[PDB]
Amino acid sequence: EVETFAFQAEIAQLMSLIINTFYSNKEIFLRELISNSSDALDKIRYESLTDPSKLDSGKELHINLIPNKQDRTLTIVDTGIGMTKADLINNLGTIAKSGTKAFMEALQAGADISMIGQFGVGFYSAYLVAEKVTVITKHNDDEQYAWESSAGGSFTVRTDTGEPMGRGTKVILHLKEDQTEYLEERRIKEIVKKHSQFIGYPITLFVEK
Numbered sequence: 001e002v003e004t005f006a007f008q009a010e011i012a013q014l015m016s017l018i019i020n021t022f023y024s025n026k027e028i029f030l031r032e033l034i035s036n037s038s039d040a041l042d043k044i045r046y047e048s049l050t051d052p053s054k055l056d057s058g059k060e061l062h063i064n065l066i067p068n069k070q071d072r073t074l075t076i077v078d079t080g081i082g083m084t085k086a087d088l089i090n091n092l093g094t095i096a097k098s099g100t101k102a103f104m105e106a107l108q109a110g111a112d113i114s115m116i117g118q119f120g121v122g123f124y125s126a127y128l129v130a131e132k133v134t135v136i137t138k139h140n141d142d143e144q145y146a147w148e149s150s151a152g153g154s155f156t157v158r159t160d161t162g163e164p165m166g167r168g169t170k171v172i173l174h175l176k177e178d179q180t181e182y183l184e185e186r187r188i189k190e191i192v193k194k195h196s197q198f199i200g201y202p203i204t205l206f207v208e209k
């Protein structure tokens with residue numbers, strides 16, 4: 001069973017702005033997603049201070065980067081707090097509404113796309129390099145769900161029947177044809193060392209076989 005939802009008009013037209021605007025500094029997408037993973041890991045670590053059973057679904061707090069040249073996908077996995085179904089549909093969209101509005105206001109005042117993280121909507125920078133984004137997430141209080149959107153005004157949510165994750169969030173970036181450079185090991189290392197050197201969690205860059 002697949003449910004189809006519409007983006008709020010503000011989020012939809014920001015996504016099209018990220019897709020259609022000529023902006024060469026696309027590498028910042030990785031910084032925003034890694035930063036999003038770092039925030040989710042901080043959340044579960046803090047909550048586990050007053051409730052250690054919240055780590056029964058996994059005690060390791062880390063970030064994995066998985067390039068796949070055959071599928072043309074780049075996957076960012078974290079063992080953070082994860083997201084519930086209401087997070088995917090209601091809660092985060094409400095936050096992204098006001099954050100998107102403020103971001104596009106600044107973009108006309110001279111700001112550029114790289115400052116998207118200051119408005120809390122850094123996730124949508126994934127569409128600088130991806131034509132489709134899939135989000136697999138598992139929260140301690142909810143089932144495993146699969147969110148997905150190729151922009152165009154809508155997204156889908158379904159119960160995930162794939163590999164159980166224990167806890168956390170998996171962001172799968174189906175890259176554009178001309179953005180295969182972010183599947184190369186040396187390029188990812190250069191971006192991580194440039195924008196995410198001080199992230200307080202281990203970042204493991206998986207090598208292909």
Ligand SMILES: O=C(NCCSCc1ccc(Cl)cc1)c1ccco1
Pocket residue numbers: 007008011087088089090092093094095096120121122123124135147
């Ligand atoms: O994008 C939507 N839902 C899935 C969000 S998961 C990635 C994410 C996206 C934005 C932010 Cl600020 C944080 C995390 C949406 C939009 C309207 C209803 O839902």
